[PDB]
Design a protein around this nucleic acid. Sequence first.
DNA 1: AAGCACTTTCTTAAAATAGTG
DNA 2: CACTATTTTAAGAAAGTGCTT
Lengths: 91, 88, 53
Amino acid sequence: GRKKIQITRIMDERNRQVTFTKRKFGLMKKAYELSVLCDCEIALIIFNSSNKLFQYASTDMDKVLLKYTEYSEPHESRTNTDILETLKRRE
Amino acid sequence: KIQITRIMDERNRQVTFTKRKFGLMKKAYELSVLCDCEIALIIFNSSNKLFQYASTDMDKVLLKYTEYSEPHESRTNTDILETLKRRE
Amino acid sequence: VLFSQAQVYELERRFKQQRYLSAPERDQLASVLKLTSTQVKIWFQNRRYKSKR
DNA sequence: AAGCACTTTCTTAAAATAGTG
DNA sequence: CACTATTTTAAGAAAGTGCTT
């Protein structure tokens, strides 16, 4: 970008909406690339601040969510706190 | 310069999977914080192992998903490829 | 630090002729490129590993 | 000794994107 | 909604590890 931004809530509503639209497509493009390069089935569910839904799924959303709900084995699970801790550990 | 086609070498596929899975979760985290949104990400790899990220409680996002009735943006691999081609 | 474009050019040209070098080939190639014998040995090992897709 | 099969540590091209017209 | 200066990502390069031949 023309300037580095801090990862903190964008307080200007207009800038927040423009950033949301650009980065949501960028995120769905990266999900598509991971799905195809590495033979992965992915679901991505996004609610914006007004609770509108935006989704990506590699092939079929309902198939991925069914596999998710039937999965009984322990599995890797990440939250914002784990992502932040990983980024900090990279000094 | 990167063609979006299956990485056929298992070892190279796994190295790319590990890098890009974290890269995707990092971008999801950034979008959730910058734009104040709720995101859930489910990844099954080629062996059907499950990797998940959510910016908030996963069960609350999935319940909101299942109750949502209105028409909404819904992308898949097929239509993302078509969008990228149209940027000729 | 990375090898010069000229060093990598000569290593790749030799690799397409012979995927494995004898000690005398390796030590003489190292002398001409101004690298150590180890650096040429390891460049050949890494190049073979990368050629396996 | 050197090969082999990864793994680590980086560098740097390629991709994404923040501010802009 | 297109452009581009700048930052970010991830593929690739030399070296590290710890075996086997």
